[PDB]
Amino acid sequence: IWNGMVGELVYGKADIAIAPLTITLVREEVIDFSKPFMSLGISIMIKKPQ
Amino acid sequence: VGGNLDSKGYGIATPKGSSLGTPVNLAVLKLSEQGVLDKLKNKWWYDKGE
């Protein structure tokens, strides 16, 4: 059972998803993707050292 | 001395209109599913440090 952005897309509740939705291979099997409009990467976040 | 500047990779390139494009792309995708690409990455990059 899909959910979220892909869940709304698969069940046809909406026509187009315009959101910070990352392109992934597993999502490619149920929804298509446009060319990447911006680059990013997973990072680590902590409170700056007091 | 820093992080990556962009998000781009290496792809197998074939002449435009070549019959080898689709089968080689399918093989690349299947090996990505099988993890042979990551295995070779480990073997040549991580498994060769001294």
Curated annotation (Swiss-Prot), chain A:
PTM summary: Palmitoylated. Depalmitoylated upon L-glutamate stimulation.
Tissue: Detected in forebrain. Detected in dendrites of neuronal cells. Expressed in the pyramidal cell layers of CA1 and CA3 and in the granule cell layer of the dentate gyrus.
Annotated localization: Cell membrane; Postsynaptic cell membrane; Postsynaptic density membrane
Induction: Down-regulated in the pyramidal cell layer of CA1 in the hippocampus by global ischemia.
Record-listed L-glutamate binding positions: 20, 22, 27
Domain of life: Eukaryota
Subunit structure: Homotetramer or heterotetramer of pore-forming glutamate receptor subunits. Tetramers may be formed by the dimerization of dimers. May interact with MPP4. Forms a ternary complex with GRIP1 and CSPG4. Interacts with ATAD1 in an ATP-dependent manner. ATAD1-catalyzed ATP hydrolysis disrupts binding to ATAD1 and to GRIP1 and leads to AMPAR complex disassembly. Interacts with GRIP2. Interacts with GRIP1. Interacts with NSF via its C-terminus. Interacts with CACNG2, PICK1 and GRIP2. Interacts with GRIA1 and SYNDIG1. Part of a complex containing GRIA2, NSF and NAPA and/or NAPB.
General remark: The postsynaptic actions of L-glutamate are mediated by a variety of receptors that are named according to their selective agonists. This receptor binds AMPA (quisqualate) > L-glutamate > kainate.
UniProt note: domains: The M4 transmembrane segment mediates tetramerization and is required for cell surface expression.
Family from the record: Belongs to the glutamate-gated ion channel (TC 1.A.10.1) family. GRIA2 subfamily.
Protein function: Ionotropic glutamate receptor that functions as a ligand-gated cation channel, gated by L-glutamate and glutamatergic agonists such as alpha-amino-3-hydroxy-5-methyl-4-isoxazolepropionic acid (AMPA), quisqualic acid, and kainic acid. L-glutamate acts as an excitatory neurotransmitter at many synapses in the central nervous system and plays an important role in fast excitatory synaptic transmission.
Name this polypeptide is given: Glutamate receptor 2
Gene: Gria2
Whole-protein coverage range: 480 to 529 of 883
